[PDB]
Amino acid sequence: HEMRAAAFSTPGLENLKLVEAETPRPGPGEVLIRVKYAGVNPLDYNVVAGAVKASPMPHIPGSEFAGVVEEAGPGVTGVSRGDPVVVYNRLYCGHCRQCLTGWTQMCEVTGGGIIGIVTQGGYAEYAVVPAKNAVATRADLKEAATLPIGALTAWNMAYRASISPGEKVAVVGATGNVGIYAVQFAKLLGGEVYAISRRKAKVESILKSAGADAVLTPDEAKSAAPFDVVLDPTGSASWDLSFGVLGRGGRYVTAGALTGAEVRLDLRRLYGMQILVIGATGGRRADFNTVVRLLEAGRIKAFLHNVYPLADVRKALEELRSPERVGKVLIAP
Amino acid sequence: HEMRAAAFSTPGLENLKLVEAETPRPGPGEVLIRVKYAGVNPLDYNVVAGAVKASPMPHIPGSEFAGVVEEAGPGVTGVSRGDPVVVYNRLYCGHCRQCLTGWTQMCEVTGGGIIGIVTQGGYAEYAVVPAKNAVATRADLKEAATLPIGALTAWNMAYRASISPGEKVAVVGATGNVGIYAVQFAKLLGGEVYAISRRKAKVESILKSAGADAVLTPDEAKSAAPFDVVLDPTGSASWDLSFGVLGRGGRYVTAGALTGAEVRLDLRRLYGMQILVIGATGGRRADFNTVVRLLEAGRIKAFLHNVYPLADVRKALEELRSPERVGKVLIAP
Amino acid sequence: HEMRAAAFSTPGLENLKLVEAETPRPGPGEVLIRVKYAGVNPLDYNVVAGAVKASPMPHIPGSEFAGVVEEAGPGVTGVSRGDPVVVYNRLYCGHCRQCLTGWTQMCEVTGGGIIGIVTQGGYAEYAVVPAKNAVATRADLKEAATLPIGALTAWNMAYRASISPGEKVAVVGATGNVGIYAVQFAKLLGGEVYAISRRKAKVESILKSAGADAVLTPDEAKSAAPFDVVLDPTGSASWDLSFGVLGRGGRYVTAGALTGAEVRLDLRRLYGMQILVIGATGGRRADFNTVVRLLEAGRIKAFLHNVYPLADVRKALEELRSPERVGKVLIAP
Amino acid sequence: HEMRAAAFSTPGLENLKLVEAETPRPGPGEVLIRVKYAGVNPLDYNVVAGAVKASPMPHIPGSEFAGVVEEAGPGVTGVSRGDPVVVYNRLYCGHCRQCLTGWTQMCEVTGGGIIGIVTQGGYAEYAVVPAKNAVATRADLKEAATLPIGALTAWNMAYRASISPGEKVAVVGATGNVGIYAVQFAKLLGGEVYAISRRKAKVESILKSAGADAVLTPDEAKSAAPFDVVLDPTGSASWDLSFGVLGRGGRYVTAGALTGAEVRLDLRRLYGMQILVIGATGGRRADFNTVVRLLEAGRIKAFLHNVYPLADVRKALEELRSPERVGKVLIAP
Ligand SMILES: [Cl-]
Ligand SMILES: [Cl-]
Ligand SMILES: [Cl-]
Ligand SMILES: [Zn+2]
Ligand SMILES: [Zn+2]
Ligand SMILES: [Zn+2]
Ligand SMILES: [Zn+2]
């Protein structure tokens, strides 16, 4: 039993090719998912490019996916064949200090391991995941496939920012997969939301439909400072802008896609203004349930740009960088 | 100089009468306000009715008002004649533990004294208040006059409820002045908002327009339980309903208009479900600024019913008890 | 195929019932629409009440709706499955004197027939309409569903009033579906706009956000006369209070919802002041395109009160007459 | 009795000198105005330069002014000493075909004579004008002085263009005195307004505050064609670049300041697209009242660059041609 998959034997986008792979089988506590849609994210790009080591090798990437349960492993209850599911992408033990306080993405036993990085991922017709990671959903699976990275990372960022109604929130990288949900969550929490894009002219309507009160270029954002919160899911790419626009008590919530991100930090400005720089990665297992429910209720929206077949995975990854891309790129195995 | 005012020398609606009164004059730290609109609230009704002691006597009630600065007291700066203002209604010292942590409504020195209860109030052409209590505003003053009690009290309740996006929030008394802002603030903070009214057949749509996701009768609320949060500004009037629909970790935020309110509390159900019963009164001075800005920005809505002249203050207080429709009743001196 | 619909076999609101009905099939020149939102208007109420004879019987009402094309009939091009559309509600031939001069609502061949009155309408999951009546739009369909009656009728009234910048325009019934757009169009054309409402305090803020320069009661309008234009979408309801506020050269533009509208006209005042009484119904097909584009550009606004499910259509229609209501009621099949 | 005035005995700005002149006295039907502010316009520049013959000689120019009535001649009513007034600048008889149909700027008896061209004008402490040309105003006279030429010419252009809401209007010379009001009036009538300027980068924010939806260079406007209306107050200066941007039924409204303005017109393109080329000069006496009321109401705005004393009249005239001028130059005698 074979399946189609995109895999690399050595890092580099040039090495990501369509192959035939043995179809995996679920053991105890696991489910086999027929992948319907997989998200295309900076994280997946950087994994393929070798920013971090993947296992196993040769490696199928794809850390964000949704699909239909094909086979439940032994002992598995609560999910059966035919169930549409979307996959929480962190392996977690459920028994360590981090898991027991809800921070499952920080699990001490698995090391925070990400499905599709330390296991084979969703750029394939089938994938095996822990049954407790598969969340049943009534949402359209194209839309649900924007949740495990894009929406959940943005939720976790906004949660860790302590946004109060009235507060001015700048979202850097607001056109990106995480950023566009960060606009939505910051507005859902009561923020006055300023979405930052160099493409303001072209993307203004999309970002306002996501809840932005204003769409500013980076240079316009500097004139609109100060901000109470900056949500910046781009690593170090915009550090100078993000840090400088914060006011007293400002919170800079930082997330990234695992590229190197060393920056110059002025501690004196940080302590003089009582700024907090707040790291965020992934999201809590409980919050993933909340995000799925918000999507089902129409309270958040999935902004989609294009869907590619598996054979076009290289083209899909390169589309991340296209100036005409506004919204999510998906793979349909 | 003399002015027109509504005053009572002894309690009872029957004894509230339009009189001539000496126009007050502002001392150090004070401003004289030409009152443009004053709200008609249960608190004012209960003050006139004698359920709470007022001073001085004979007494001019009116704890919620907006107007134009007529005269600034000796030394007063930052507030000028002609400025339109809306009045924070708690006297606060700024130096005690409560004031210094931001809980100005809990001031240990003034005892939380409410303007128009321990001072002469706004049911008069002119009122004297502390200059630090007068907030300049560009909002229409009829809408501003809904903020000092209705909006601020609701803001404070929702703030004290720790509403997280996705949580199920029930608002009891949702058709009242506080309750209709509580609907708005629960939605502003990300709650899934269920407005509860015996009068759902008549008020469903107006409450949806305030932000409710659904409107339920009490019996429907019991069927839709559990709720994560109940916001109940009606004192003890719906205690059994509000307490019994809470689920695990539920927060019941309670506020009222100073009438007697003893209830039967089952501590075993409270601790078995880890419920919190949370008292709320007034609001923080800082939060009053935020509420004013939110109204000026159009992020919250003033639901108004009718404006009465001062000579019809008794008909205005009766309209509060038996309303032709939902919304704030105002007096215009 | 069967669909859910609200239908009546005999007039009366109590006879309007949820039924299963045969899903219609589009014939030549027609499209099948999956209705997303349908407006609730006085006209729909009067159809259900029997003030207006409807065909066929039993009858599915609903003359204002927007949705997504499901199927194109034989010979149809320019429109395909998936297209969001909003429906011009007048049947027109395109070849008569009226159609060829642009007055498609006055078509001599169809007799002006109104979709949902002489055809089955939009209070159902699906509806068939002429392909040339379906306008593709990128607007939110909830907002687009306010255009076929409310906005278009108001546009046609304002267009027929010859409003010049500076002219004083009174809008009666200004909070109704048509009236609230008539405020907007009178301001868009340069008029000085006085919205007339006896509920002044309740509705002043929404009417100012619609473009009113002032909100007056009917008695204040009498004191503020003369006006150059009255826009009256209320049939005969406001005539006796309003005709007398017009000055020399004044234009009284009348529209309505097909109930009886007999009034007494003082002809000597009419000719002595060179007043014009101008009938207005529906709107021109070309102007419907303009109105759609204005909504897409954010130059006009939909003011929404509540959306009901199809099962609650009776409550939706009764809400039309509610004292609590301000703004548009929609049905979502 | 003597006054200061700027007068020229021979054409050329270098010959416009401050002199001591006999203060005029008002005859029957005339008022003496103490000039407070006089506009500096291309027309005034071209009168001084000799492109337009003036009388009497030596000549006091200045065709656009506002001031205070100092003295009423015999038979003046409805205009009294002390009244702030702004002056309609066309002499008109009130009894010819043109005056009796409203086109007072086309008066057959006076020949369209312009105050300050065929009479001594407002670049002096005092000027005599017909009482019926003086309009009392409560607006600031510095802003009123922008109306007799700049605003009224723009009004008459936009009126003659039959602008309908939604129509695309290009304004050439949008930074000029007429053009900046043409932007406002085109927007006031509901047009989608594109302001054309080679100095786009520096004037963008000002033209947007005047109502422009976009600010384009001439070459950018070619790419945005077709337009329904071009408003061109610059004579022949922009014709070759602008006539071709018009679409079907387009209207090209032309005004100017009396210099040579011969152009090449392709009649075949004109009749093939049913284009109209529409001459506009001055404005109607009735429309001047409307424009004054619109300024008093804040519906139009005076955009001012600088005010100069009468001694600096030569600097003020040359500032018309400065690349750094954005807005009106005034003289204050
Ligand atoms: Cl991205
Ligand atoms: Cl209506
Ligand atoms: Cl100019
Ligand atoms: Zn763990
Ligand atoms: Zn204190
Ligand atoms: Zn026809
Ligand atoms: Zn004449």
Q: Please spell the DSSP secondary structure of C146-169, one letter per residue.
A: TIIIIIHHHHHHHHHTT--TT-EE
A160, A233 in Cβ contact below 8 A?
no
Strand ranges, E, within chain C = 2-7, 17-22, 30-40, 65-72, 84-87, 126-130, 134-136, 168-171, 192-196, 214-216, 227-232, 246-254, 276-279, 304-309, 328-332
Q: Which residues of B18-35 are buried (b: 16+ CB within 10 A; e: fewer)?
A: bbebebbebeeebbbbbb
Residue showing tokens 């000597």: C268
Two tokens, residue D135: 């309009």
Task: Return d(Cα B205, Cα B175) in angstroms, integer.
Answer: 11
**CA triple C273-C275-C276, angle to 5 deg:** 165
DSSP character for B206? Answer: H
Peptide bond into A58 cis (omega under 30): yes
Cα C29 from Cα D283, distance rounded (Å) = 51
- The C-alpha atoms of residue B129 and residue B122 are separated, in whole angstroms, by 10
Contact between residue C53 and residue C114 where contact means Cβ atoms under 8 Å apart: no
CB contact under 8 A, D189 and C294: no
Say if the Cβ atoms of B205 and C324 lie within 8 Å: yes
Closest partner CB to A189 (pick from B185, B190, B293): B190
- Tell me the C-alpha distance between B229 and B249, whole Å: 9
Which one-letter amino acid corresponds to residue B99? C
Distance from CA of C237 to the nearest CA of B (A): 22
Resolution in A: 1.8
Alpha-carbon distance of D50 to D29, in angstroms, equals 30
Domain ranges of chain D: 1-147+282-333, 148-281
Closest alpha carbon to B23 in B60, B53, B54, B66: B60
The ligand placed nearest to the CA atom of residue A149 is 1
Ligand nearest to the CA of A107: 4
In which order are the strands placed within the sheet that holds A214-216?
Answer: A214-216, A192-196, A168-171, A227-232, A246-254, A276-279
As a three-state string, the secondary structure of chain A is CEEEEEEECCCCHHHCEEEEEECCCCCCCEEEEEEEEEEECHHHHHHHHCCCCCCCCCECCCCCEEEEEEEECCCCCCCCCCCEEEECCECCCCCCHHHHCCCHHHCCCCCCCECCCCCCCCCECEEEEEHHHEEECCCCHHHHCCHHHHHHHHHHHHHHCCCCCCCEEEECCCCCHHHHHHHHHHHHCCCEEEEECCCHHHHHHHHHHCCCCEEECHHHHHHHCCEEEEEECCCCCCHHHHHHCEEEEEEEEECCCCCCCCCCCCHHHHHHCCCEEEECCCCCHHHHHHHHHHHHCCCCCCCEEEEEEHHHHHHHHHHHHCCCCCCEEEEEC
CB-based contact A179:A233 (threshold 8 Å): yes
From first CA to last CA, the distance across chain D in angstroms is 17
**H or E stretch at D179:** helix D177-188
Q: Partners for D (CB, 8 Å, 3+ pairs)?
A: C
For residue C113, how far is its CA from the centre of ligand 6 (angstroms)? 11
The two beta strands, D30-40 and D65-72, are antiparallel
DSSP B309: E
CA of residue B183 relative to chain centroid, distance: 14
Closest CA to D79 of D65, D69, D89, D88: D69
Please return the burial class of C288, using the count of CB atoms within 10 Å of its CB with bins 0-12, 13-18 and 19+: buried
**Residue recorded with tokens 């004191």:** C223
Question: Is residue C22 a contact partner of residue C4, using CB atoms and an 8 Å limit?
Answer: no
Pick from D172, D219, D222: nearest CA to D195 = D172
Would you list which residues of chain B are within 8 Å, Cβ to Cβ, of chain A? 165-166, 185, 188-190, 192, 290, 293-294, 297, 299
Structure tokens at B127: 């009122």
Q: Which positions of D make up the binding site for Zn(2+)?
A: 93, 96, 99, 107
Radius of gyration of chain C (CA): 19
Instruction: Give the Cα separation of C181 and A153 in Å (integer).
Output: 42
> What dihedral angle (degrees, nearest 10) is formed by the CA atoms of D49, D55, D57, D58?
-70
Distance in angstroms (rounded) separating the CA atoms of residues A76 and C132? 55
CB contact under 8 A, D189 and C192: no
Nearest C-alpha in D relative to C155: D165
- Is the CB of residue A179 less than 8 Å from the CB of residue A121? no
Task: Name the residue type at position A11.
Answer: P
What is the C-alpha to C-alpha distance for residues A18 and A35, in angstroms, rounded to an integer?
A: 16
CB neighbourhood size of B326 (10 A): 24
Residue with tokens 């995480």: A178
Nearest to D171 by CA among D234, D111, D115, D116: D234
Give the separation between CA D31 and CA D126, rounded to whole angstroms: 10
The residue to which tokens 């090495």 are assigned:
A15
Q: How far apart are CA D178 and CA D175, in angstroms?
A: 8
The span from the CA of D299 to the CA of D181, in Å, is 11
Phi, psi for residue B216 in degrees, rounded to 5: -130, 150
Report the number of secondary-structure helices (H) and strands (E) in chain C: 11, 15
DSSP class per residue in B140-171: -HHHHTTIIIIIHHHHHHHHHTT--TT-EEEE
Kindly give the distance from the C-alpha atom of residue D4 to the centroid of ligand 3, in angstroms, as a whole number. Answer: 26
Tokens of residue C255, six digits: 């529209």
**Residues of C in Cβ contact (< 8 Å) with D166:** 290, 293-294
Contact D204, D224 (CB under 8 A): no
Say how far apart CA D209 and CA D184 lie, in whole Å. 9
Cα gap A250→A267, rounded to integer Å: 14
Beta bridge partners of A87: A134
Crossing angle for the helix pair A200-209 and A177-188, to the nearest 10 degrees: 50
Interacting residues of B223 by C-beta distance below 8 A, sequence separation 6+: none
Q: Is A213 left (phi over 0), alpha (psi -120 to 50) or beta?
A: alpha
Measure the N-to-C terminal CA separation of chain B; round to a whole number of Å.
16
**CA-closest candidate to residue D77, choices D115, D134, D140, D144:** D134
Contact C40, C306 (CB under 8 A): no
Query: Quick one: which H or E segment has residue D58?
Result: none
Report d(CA C209, CA D76) in Å as an integer.
44
- C315·B206 Cβ contact <8 A: no
- In one-letter notation, the amino acid at residue B48 is V
Say whether the peptide bond before residue D58 is cis (omega within 30 degrees of 0).
yes
Distances (CA, A) of D71 to D23, D25, D84, D140: 12, 8, 12, 21
- What whole-number distance in Å separates Cα of residue B47 and Cα of residue B120? 12
Q: Is C245 helix (H, G, I), strand (E, B) or coil?
A: helix
Which of A192, A219, A189, A195 shows the shortest CA–CA distance to A207?
A: A195
Q: Is C34 helix (H, G, I), strand (E, B) or coil?
A: strand
| Residue C82 backbone class (left: φ over 0; alpha: ψ -120 to 50; beta: rest) | left
Q: Is the peptide bond before D11 cis (omega within 30 degrees of 0)?
A: no
Q: How far apart are CA A111 and CA A104, in angstroms?
A: 10
The DSSP secondary-structure symbol of D90 reads B
Binding residues of D for NADPH: 90, 153, 175, 177-178, 197-199, 255, 257-258, 281-282, 325
Whether there are 3 or more C-beta pairs closer than 8 Å between B and D is no
CA atoms within 13 A on the CB side of B327: 24
Secondary element (H or E) of residue B316:
helix B313-321
Backbone φ, ψ for residue C212 (5° rounding):
-65, 135
Domain D1-147+282-333 CATH assignment equals 3.90.180.10: yes
Which residue in this structure is represented by tokens 């407070």? D36
Which amino acid does the sequence have at C187?
A: K
Find out whether A2 and A18 touch, Cβ atoms under 8 Å: no
C168 phi and psi, to 5 degrees? Answer: -90, 120
Q: Is C18 exposed, middle or buried (0-12, 13-18, 19+ CB in 10 A)?
A: middle
Is residue D300 a contact partner of residue D277, using CB atoms and an 8 Å limit? Answer: no
Which residues are CB-contacts of B201 (< 8 A; sequence separation ≥ 6)? C315
Residue D275 tokens read as 């284009």
Query: How far is residue A12's CA from residue A16's CA, in Å, rounded to a whole number?
Result: 7
Give, as one character, the DSSP assignment of residue D114.
Answer: B
3-state DSSP assignment of residue C187: helix
Q: How far is CA B175 from the centre of its chain?
A: 13
Of B187, B150, B159, the closest CA to residue B280 belongs to B159
Closest by CA position to C31, among listed C112, C133, C137:
C133
- Phi and psi angles of residue D87, each rounded to the nearest 5 degrees, phi first: -105, 120
Distance (Å, whole) CA B128 – CA A296: 53
Residue C121: count of CB within 10 angstroms of its CB: 29
Cβ proximity of A301 and A210 under 8 Å: yes
CA B198, B203, B205 angle in degrees (round to 5)?
135
* Residue whose C-alpha is closest to residue B120's, from B191, B68, B63, B195: B63
Question: Which residue in A190, A192, A294 is closest to B166 by CB distance?
Answer: A294
Residues of chain C contacting D, Cβ within 8 Å: 164-166, 185, 188-190, 192, 290, 293-294, 297, 299
Q: Which CATH class is domain B148-281?
A: alpha beta
Write out chain C residues lying below 8 Å of B306, CB-based.
201-202
In a 3-state reduction of DSSP, which class is residue B274? coil
Q: Nearest ligand to the C-alpha of residue A90?
A: 4
Measured in angstroms, how far is the CA atom of residue A176 from the centroid of ligand 1?
4
- Name residue A4's beta-bridge partners: A20
Both tokens of residue B174?
Answer: 């949702």
Distance A20 CA to ligand 1 centre (A): 28
**Degrees to nearest 5, angle at CA B27 with B24 and B30:** 90
Which residue type is seen at B185? Answer: F
Which secondary-structure segment (H or E) carries D11? none
Substitution target from D169, D188, D248 for chain C, most C beta carbons within 10 A: D188
Contact B203, B176 (CB under 8 A): no
CA dist., res. D166 & res. C296, Å (int): 11
How many CB atoms neighbour CB D237 within 10 A? 16
Q: How far apart are CA D59 and CA C169, in angstroms?
A: 46
Tokens 């419907």 sit on residue: C288
Q: Which residues contact D91 (CB under 8 A, 6 or more apart)?
A: D107, D110, D112, D113, D114, D115, D118, D119, D130, D133
Q: Is A107 annotated as belonging to a binding site?
A: yes
| DSSP-based three-state secondary structure for D104 | helix
Tell me the C-alpha to C-alpha distance, in Å, between residue B26 and each of B29, B126, D286.
Answer: 8, 11, 52
Tokens of B318: 């009766």
Residue with tokens 């002032």: C214
The per-residue DSSP string of B215-272 comes to EE-HHHHHHH--EEEEEE-STTTTHHHHHHTEEEEEEEEE---SS-------HHHHHH
